[PDB]
Design an enzyme around this catalytic site. Structure first.
Site, PDB file in Angstrom:
ATOM      1  N   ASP A   7     -13.827  31.874  33.051  1.00 23.55           N
ATOM      2  CA  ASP A   7     -13.358  30.739  33.827  1.00 23.55           C
ATOM      3  C   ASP A   7     -12.096  30.226  33.138  1.00 23.55           C
ATOM      4  O   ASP A   7     -12.166  29.624  32.063  1.00 23.55           O
ATOM      5  CB  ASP A   7     -14.470  29.679  33.795  1.00 23.55           C
ATOM      6  CG  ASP A   7     -13.997  28.289  34.275  1.00 23.55           C
ATOM      7  OD1 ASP A   7     -12.957  28.163  34.951  1.00 23.55           O
ATOM      8  OD2 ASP A   7     -14.662  27.302  33.909  1.00 23.55           O
ATOM      9  N   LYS A  68      -2.149  25.813  34.540  1.00 21.63           N
ATOM     10  CA  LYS A  68      -2.742  26.227  35.824  1.00 21.63           C
ATOM     11  C   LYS A  68      -2.103  25.504  37.020  1.00 21.63           C
ATOM     12  O   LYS A  68      -2.145  26.022  38.149  1.00 21.63           O
ATOM     13  CB  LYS A  68      -4.249  25.956  35.807  1.00 21.63           C
ATOM     14  CG  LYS A  68      -4.997  26.527  36.977  1.00 21.63           C
ATOM     15  CD  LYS A  68      -6.493  26.561  36.664  1.00 21.63           C
ATOM     16  CE  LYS A  68      -7.300  27.078  37.809  1.00 21.63           C
ATOM     17  NZ  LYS A  68      -8.756  27.037  37.440  1.00 21.63           N
ATOM     18  N   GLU A 172     -13.710  30.438  42.239  1.00 20.59           N
ATOM     19  CA  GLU A 172     -14.632  29.597  41.457  1.00 20.59           C
ATOM     20  C   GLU A 172     -15.956  29.228  42.164  1.00 20.59           C
ATOM     21  O   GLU A 172     -17.042  29.442  41.601  1.00 20.59           O
ATOM     22  CB  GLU A 172     -13.921  28.376  40.887  1.00 20.59           C
ATOM     23  CG  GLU A 172     -12.883  28.789  39.857  1.00 20.59           C
ATOM     24  CD  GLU A 172     -11.888  27.724  39.505  1.00 20.59           C
ATOM     25  OE1 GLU A 172     -12.134  26.517  39.800  1.00 20.59           O
ATOM     26  OE2 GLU A 172     -10.831  28.128  38.947  1.00 20.59           O
ATOM     27  N   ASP A 196     -17.644  20.316  42.729  1.00 12.81           N
ATOM     28  CA  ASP A 196     -17.021  20.678  41.444  1.00 12.81           C
ATOM     29  C   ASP A 196     -16.093  19.562  40.953  1.00 12.81           C
ATOM     30  O   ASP A 196     -14.975  19.412  41.427  1.00 12.81           O
ATOM     31  CB  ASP A 196     -16.286  22.019  41.610  1.00 12.81           C
ATOM     32  CG  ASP A 196     -15.707  22.533  40.299  1.00 12.81           C
ATOM     33  OD1 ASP A 196     -15.601  21.748  39.304  1.00 12.81           O
ATOM     34  OD2 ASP A 196     -15.410  23.756  40.268  1.00 12.81           O
TER      35      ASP A 196
HETATM   36  N1  LIG Z   1     -21.658  15.550  29.049  1.00  8.52           N
HETATM   37  C1  LIG Z   1     -20.564  15.166  29.740  1.00  8.52           C
HETATM   38  N2  LIG Z   1     -20.489  14.006  30.444  1.00  8.52           N
HETATM   39  C2  LIG Z   1     -19.385  13.650  31.125  1.00  8.52           C
HETATM   40  N3  LIG Z   1     -18.272  14.427  31.199  1.00  8.52           N
HETATM   41  C3  LIG Z   1     -18.247  15.606  30.514  1.00  8.52           C
HETATM   42  C4  LIG Z   1     -19.407  16.063  29.773  1.00  8.52           C
HETATM   43  N4  LIG Z   1     -19.106  17.259  29.220  1.00  8.52           N
HETATM   44  C5  LIG Z   1     -17.842  17.570  29.594  1.00  8.52           C
HETATM   45  N5  LIG Z   1     -17.336  16.561  30.365  1.00  8.52           N
HETATM   46  C6  LIG Z   1     -16.027  16.464  30.986  1.00  8.52           C
HETATM   47  O1  LIG Z   1     -15.855  17.594  31.821  1.00  8.52           O
HETATM   48  C7  LIG Z   1     -14.450  17.757  31.984  1.00  8.52           C
HETATM   49  C8  LIG Z   1     -14.157  19.239  31.859  1.00  8.52           C
HETATM   50  O2  LIG Z   1     -14.790  19.989  32.921  1.00  8.52           O
HETATM   51  P1  LIG Z   1     -14.896  21.599  32.807  1.00  8.52           P
HETATM   52  O3  LIG Z   1     -15.680  22.052  34.024  1.00  8.52           O
HETATM   53  O4  LIG Z   1     -15.278  22.013  31.440  1.00  8.52           O
HETATM   54  O5  LIG Z   1     -13.321  22.008  32.927  1.00  8.52           O
HETATM   55  P2  LIG Z   1     -12.365  22.325  34.181  1.00  8.52           P
HETATM   56  O6  LIG Z   1     -12.458  21.153  35.148  1.00  8.52           O
HETATM   57  O7  LIG Z   1     -11.009  22.411  33.510  1.00  8.52           O
HETATM   58  O8  LIG Z   1     -12.864  23.611  34.769  1.00  8.52           O
HETATM   59  C9  LIG Z   1     -13.740  16.909  30.936  1.00  8.52           C
HETATM   60  O9  LIG Z   1     -13.205  15.739  31.620  1.00  8.52           O
HETATM   61  C10 LIG Z   1     -14.870  16.535  29.992  1.00  8.52           C
HETATM   62  O10 LIG Z   1     -14.674  15.342  29.230  1.00  8.52           O
HETATM   63 MG   LIG Z   2     -13.576  24.215  36.552  1.00  9.66          MG
HETATM   64 NA    NA Z   3     -13.700  25.197  33.336  1.00  8.17          NA
END
Ligand SMILES: Nc1ncnc2c1ncn2[C@@H]1O[C@H](COP(=O)(O)OP(=O)(O)O)[C@@H](O)[C@H]1O
Ligand SMILES: [Mg+2]
Ligand code: NA
Length: 379
Positions: A7, A68, A172, A196
């Site tokens: 990812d 991205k 995704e 998402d």
């Molecule tokens: N336990 C949690 N509670 C709330 N937010 C979280 C938690 N773990 C990760 N995040 C938040 O998730 C976001 C990242 O999402 P992720 O799906 O890893 O990345 P992306 O959106 O880039 O694919 C960040 O804003 C991060 O702070």
């Molecule tokens: Mg993502």
């Molecule tokens: Na991600």
């Protein structure tokens, strides 16, 4: 050698591998199951992932993120022109293609977005190789459903630069559905909604799956809503609190704002599992330590409008798909921000008490499905 699923996220990336009958999500050198999509250039080194994000306050101009948002786009694209007003790093025009321009080892250098993403992908590849004990050469890499051919091409190019044979570029939401085994259904339509909410984007997708064949029926959301916005609400709240406690405005000290932002993101994560979090920032501003706390309830208030705003794209996607809520067979949580209890409550309530699929860490579901697909493609 096993093939891997990656990812390549806007804010965080994740890598998984299917072997021995199961997927394992692979933690990096710091023990983290996701890695920031950040690359930093210093007077002496190139840092990728945690190391890059961890020095962003120190080195804002040469710490690249959000590649991205540029990948596969023309320089004069209105998206690019608009986004660049908000980044600390320079974006330049080379033949109507954007390049990020930084200082590296004392020299001015510029990189195409796919070069920056190749560096993230290299880190993800290396994370996988450390776990497997051998070199990895095959990968499935994911992209948003709305990515066009140019954005998909440039993403593929990033993987190839990183030394990967890109088995396939898959969407995704599709990867997330695969993670839950929703691609095995048989004849008969199954409607799946992927919710998402990530670090910088919010994507709603409705898929119809019929005998393993995926159709994207509807998409909606906001490419500028995500965890970063919740971090910022906390930032503005603590900026105000610091003013009242110490009669000083920290808001024009870029380093202090960035360090407070880091602490806020951490406290936010903690509030997904606890009802209170402590912030302790040594020497936040003019040697003043900032030692405070916030409740889950106060965090929910600060973000209430933003949380509630996630429901209208669900409403729109359902309308566009011509489906009633009751016609959705599965609801799948993706993106780290869906770990927030209030977000889950909103979506579950909107769906009149329906189960949410959340047994796979939402920030890992896309990698998980990519890993399964990669294995299928290897045979
Ligand atoms: N336990 C949690 N509670 C709330 N937010 C979280 C938690 N773990 C990760 N995040 C938040 O998730 C976001 C990242 O999402 P992720 O799906 O890893 O990345 P992306 O959106 O880039 O694919 C960040 O804003 C991060 O702070
Ligand atoms: Mg993502
Ligand atoms: Na991600």
């Amino acid at each position: 050698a096993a093939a891997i699923g990656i990812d390549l996220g806007t804010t965080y990336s994740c890598v998984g591998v299917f072997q021995h009958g199961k997927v394992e999500i692979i933690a990096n050198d710091q023990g983290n199951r996701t890695t920031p999509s950040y690359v930093a250039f210093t007077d002496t080194e190139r840092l990728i992932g945690d190391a890059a994000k961890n020095q962003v306050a120190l080195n804002p101009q040469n710490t690249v993120f959000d590649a991205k948002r540029l990948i596969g786009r023309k320089f004069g694209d209105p998206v690019v022109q608009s986004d660049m007003k908000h980044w600390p790093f320079q974006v330049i025009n080379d033949g109507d293609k954007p390049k990020v321009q930084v200082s590296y080892k004392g020299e001015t250098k510029a990189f195409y977005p796919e070069e920056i993403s190749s560096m993230v992908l290299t880190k993800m590849k290396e994370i996988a190789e450390a776990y497997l004990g051998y070199p990895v050469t095959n990968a499935v890499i994911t992209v948003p459903a709305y990515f066009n051919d140019s954005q998909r091409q440039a993403t593929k190019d990033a993987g190839v630069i990183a030394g990967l044979n890109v088995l396939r570029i898959i969407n995704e939401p599709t990867a997330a559905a695969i993670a839950y085994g929703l691609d095995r259904t048989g004849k008969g339509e199954r409607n799946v909604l992927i919710f998402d909410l990530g670090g910088g984007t919010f994507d709603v997708s409705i898929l119809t799956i019929d005998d393993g064949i995926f159709e994207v029926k509807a998409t909606a959301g906001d490419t500028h809503l995500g965890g970063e916005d919740f971090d910022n609400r906390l930032v503005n709240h603590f900026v105000e609190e610091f003013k009242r406690k110490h009669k000083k405005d920290i808001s024009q000290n870029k380093r202090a704002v960035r360090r407070l932002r880091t602490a806020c993101e951490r406290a936010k994560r903690t509030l997904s599992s606890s009802t209170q979090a402590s912030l302790e920032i040594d020497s936040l501003f003019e040697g003043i330590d900032f030692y405070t706390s916030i409740t889950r309830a106060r965090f929910e208030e600060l973000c209430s409008d933003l949380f509630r705003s996630t429901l209208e794209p669900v409403e729109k996607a359902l309308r566009d798909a011509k489906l009633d809520k009751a016609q959705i067979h599965d609801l799948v949580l993706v993106g780290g921000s869906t770990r927030i209890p209030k977000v889950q409550k909103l979506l579950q309530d909107f769906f009149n008490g329906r189960d949410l699929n959340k047994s796979i860490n939402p920030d890992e579901a896309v990698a998980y499905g990519a890993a399964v697909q990669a294995a299928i493609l290897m045979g």
